[PDB]
Amino acid sequence: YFKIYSKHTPINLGRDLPQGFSALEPLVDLPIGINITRFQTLLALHRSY
Amino acid sequence: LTGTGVLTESNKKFLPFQQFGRDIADTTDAVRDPQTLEILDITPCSFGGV
Ligand SMILES: *[C@@H]1O[C@H](CO)[C@@H](O)[C@H](O)[C@H]1NC(C)=O
């Protein structure tokens, strides 16, 4: 189960990772047997910002 | 989840992902109806010494 505990927090970012407490609710718990041992994000947007 | 209790309406709010609902113990103080997705309020039947 690839759990994705996502909280799209509707708060401001006066500063990054601000203080306070924000619990994360799982959104998708993907059942898949896989060995992730790396990672990378994408900005593939054509008009990459 | 098999047990004995007094099923009743619950004012508790089970966040979407929240299936069952124990309390400060281990007792399923609440269940979400498989169907109708309703938050019940399972409570033990009124026993007591005589
Ligand atoms: C998954 O990949 C890593 C990196 O190659 C490897 O060390 C690991 O043994 C793999 N996991 C499994 C399923 O054996």
**Strand partners of residue A26:** A5
Q: What angle do CA B47, B11, B40 make, to 5 degrees?
A: 55
Experimentally, the structure was elucidated by cryo-EM
Task: State the Cα–Cα distance between residues B16 and B4, nearest whole angstrom.
Answer: 25
* Tokens representing residue B45 in the block: 């039947």
Q: Which residues line ligand 1 (CB under 6 A)?
A: A 35, 37
- Taking a C-beta distance cutoff of 8 angstroms, is the pair A26, A5 a contact? yes
Task: State the Cα–Cα distance between residues B21 and B31, nearest whole angstrom.
Answer: 6
Is residue B40 classed exposed, middle or buried when 0-12, 13-18 and 19+ CB atoms within 10 A define those classes?
Answer: buried
CA of A12 to the centre of ligand 1 (A): 40
In DSSP notation, B1-48 reads: --------B------TT------SSS-----B-TTTT-BB--------
Greatest Cα pair distance, chain B, in angstroms, is: 43
